[PDB]
């Protein structure tokens, strides 16, 4: 009558991610109910339905002055481990994983006073060459035009372009799934103002929401700070 | 969630007759088919549907001469471990067990030339007394008459008579389930022949088939040869 | 309430071919889909629907010259571990096993120039005697005739002839399931050419496809190279 059993080789090993649970030692606990609002279910939701504020030289905005031309104003290696992301939600959430996937939405909010106006070419430059350095160089690529004084805020979608079914949340010395390109805002014109002695510059905030097709995978543990 | 188990006291013991099988390590082997005739299923079948040839002083026959009378011609302790069985199938098959059960059929084939004739009293003597020594002594018991020259071969059934539901395949110093009796052939008359200078004797083969009610039980391992 | 269990004798042993799988430690991984063409299912398919090129003195063809007669041109011990197979697919695939089974198809492609013509007796000689040495010797056996200049390529099926339900993928000192015979191509006539100063010889490629009834069994590990 005793069952006939063979003790599988690993038998007394631990393994920290067992798909199964441990034995209860305090049953019959009924818990008090909770109304408490905003219970989130999945982390991608807040990342999608929520704008984070970028990071450039310490501040979450870039400047336009009454003097600029083709000098690129905003530039970033499209990688989660990119600079201008460092501060943000999305970026930091992804540290909790290995692979990211999808487009990201950028929100630029021009905040210069109403007496003021200006325009920019926000463009996305595909990860080949050696990075453009003037508007007339980027223009040949995917970009749109933003005339602050039509919308004082604009959204721009940095797409997902890669043989890579998934991408690298933890970038490094340039690999084929390490980068997806470059986001660049350029100054189409300069700062026109009612009176240039008062308004000489403008601050465009730049926020980052997660893409609708955005997803993350393979949870990971934290390496040495660096 | 782990099941709650208690390790039955014998747990890591071996036991060579487990009613269960071991773990496979080479699955998906389909074997080639076999027409090959005469696949037997059970050993009692060949033992029943098959005559073995007895053993007397080294030969498988007994002799009648033109001189015999009541001197018993063929005699055997009805036990499987009897002498005149030693050579045979049935007997040797039974070594593979502990208990036998049932009647056995004897086939005597008179093989003296056709110019020849003779008769015998084959009798079975129940395991009490101290064994008969003359025809007129055995006659009072179970026996029939064989006139070679009516059938040149005859069959005789040594019955199963015992309080013993089963009997001893491995006999020894006389016990109550050790012996079932004695088979004896006697010479009813002697060898009549056309010309006694040519045919002076006759050889009756004696074979042993297994009884229809014959059965064996309790498989055993082999002791020291003896 | 704890279950009563006995620890089967092998209990903490390993065994590398368990018909069962190990415990998961990273669940919920959904994988990206793959269109990617030509996924094969079973190795016998490519071996059947695919011609490999034989091996003779280093090259995958045999020569006919304007001088030949009965000297056998192509000869091979029908065994997978035969010479003229060494280079091929089928042969090398079989190394992965113990037993082979079935016919093999040979494809001879005569490649001498169109100004050229010749004929051969491809024959199969059964594994008895001591191997034939002239056309007129083999002719009495299974063979057909190939007149290059009717088909410039021909197929010939080396059959499976053996009491052996299966055969030896790993041949050796001649056993009864070690060899199935001998393939031999002979030169029926010689090289006739428009101008013998240009075309004096011809190269017949010889390829090997797996037989429709061909099958392999009992996967094995690799011994010392030799």
């Amino acid at each position: 009558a005793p069952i006939r059993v063979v003790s599988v080789p690993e038998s007394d090993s631990f393994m920290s991610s067992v798909p199964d649970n441990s034995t209860p030692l305090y049953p019959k606990v009924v818990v008090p109910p909770r109304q408490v609002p905003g219970r989130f279910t999945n982390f991608i939701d807040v990342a999608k339905q929520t704008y984070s504020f970028c990071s450039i030289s310490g501040k979450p905005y870039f400047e336009v002055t009454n003097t600029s031309g083709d000098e690129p104003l905003f530039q970033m290696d499209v990688s989660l481990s990119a600079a201008e992301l460092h501060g943000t939600y999305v970026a930091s959430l992804s540290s909790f994983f290995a692979q990211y996937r999808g487009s990201l939405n950028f929100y630029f909010i021009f905040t210069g006073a109403a007496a003021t106006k200006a325009k920019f070419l926000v463009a996305f430059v595909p990860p080949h060459s050696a990075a453009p350095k003037t508007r007339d160089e980027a223009m040949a690529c995917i970009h749109a035009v933003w005339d602050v004084g039509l919308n004082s805020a604009f959204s721009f979608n940095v797409p997902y372009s890669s043989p890579a079914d998934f991408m690298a949340v933890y970038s490094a010395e340039a690999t084929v799934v390490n980068v997806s390109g470059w986001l660049q805002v350029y100054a189409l014109t300069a700062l026109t103002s009612t009176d240039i002695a008062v308004n000489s510059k403008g601050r465009v905030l730049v926020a980052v929401s997660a893409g609708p097709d955005f997803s993350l995978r393979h949870p990971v543990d934290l390496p040495d700070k660096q | 969630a782990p099941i709650r188990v208690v390790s039955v006291p014998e747990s890591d013991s071996f036991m060579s007759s487990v009613p269960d099988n071991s773990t496979p390590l080479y699955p998906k082997v389909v074997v080639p088919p076999r027409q090959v005739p005469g696949r037997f299923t059970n050993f009692i079948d060949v033992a029943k549907q098959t005559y073995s040839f007895c053993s007397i002083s080294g030969k498988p026959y007994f002799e009648v001469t033109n001189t015999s009378g009541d001197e018993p011609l063929f005699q055997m302790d009805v036990s499987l471990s009897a002498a005149e069985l030693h050579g045979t199938y049935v007997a040797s098959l039974s070594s593979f067990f502990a208990q036998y059960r049932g009647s056995l059929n004897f086939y005597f084939i008179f093989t003296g030339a056709a110019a020849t004739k003779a008769k015998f009293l084959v009798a079975f003597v129940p395991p009490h007394s101290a064994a008969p020594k003359t025809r007129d002594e055995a006659m009072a018991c179970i026996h029939a008459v064989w006139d070679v020259g009516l059938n040149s071969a005859f069959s005789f059934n040594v019955p199963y008579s015992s309080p013993a539901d089963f009997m001893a395949v491995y006999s020894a110093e006389a016990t109550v389930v050790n012996v079932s009796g004695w088979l004896q052939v006697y010479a009813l008359t002697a060898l009549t022949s056309t010309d006694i200078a040519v045919n002076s004797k006759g050889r009756v083969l004696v074979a042993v088939s297994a009884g229809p009610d014959f059965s064996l039980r309790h498989p055993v391992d082999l002791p020291d040869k003896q | 309430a704890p279950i009563r269990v006995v620890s089967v004798p092998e209990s903490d042993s390993f065994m590398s071919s368990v018909p069962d799988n190990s415990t998961p430690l990273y669940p919920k991984v959904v994988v990206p889909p793959r269109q990617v063409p030509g996924r094969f299912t079973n190795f016998i398919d490519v071996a059947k629907q695919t011609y490999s090129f034989c091996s003779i003195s280093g090259k995958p063809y045999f020569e006919v010259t304007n001088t030949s007669g009965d000297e056998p041109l192509f000869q091979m011990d029908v065994s997978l571990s035969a010479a003229e197979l060494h280079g091929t697919y089928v042969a090398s695939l079989s190394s992965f096993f113990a037993q082979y089974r079935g016919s093999l198809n040979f494809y001879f492609i005569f490649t001498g120039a169109a100004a050229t013509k010749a004929k051969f007796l491809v024959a199969f000689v059964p594994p008895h005697s001591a191997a034939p040495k002239t056309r007129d010797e083999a002719m009495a056996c299974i063979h057909a005739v190939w007149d290059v200049g009717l088909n410039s390529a021909f197929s010939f099926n080396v059959p499976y002839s053996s009491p052996a339900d299966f055969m030896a993928v790993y041949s050796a000192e001649a056993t009864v399931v070690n060899v199935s015979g001998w393939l031999q191509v002979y030169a029926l006539t010689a090289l006739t050419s428009t101008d013998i100063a240009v075309n004096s010889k011809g190269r017949v490629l010889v390829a090997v496809s797996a037989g429709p009834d061909f099958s392999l069994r009992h996967p094995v590990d690799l011994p010392d190279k030799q």
Partner: peptide, 21 residues
């Protein structure tokens, strides 16, 4: 969320964990 065996309910839904109202 991550409980995936069959024996995961070796113990009751009542005994094992906690219960809301």
């Amino acid at each position: 969320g991550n409980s995936g065996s069959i024996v995961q309910n070796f113990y009751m839904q009542q005994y094992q964990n906690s219960i809301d109202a």
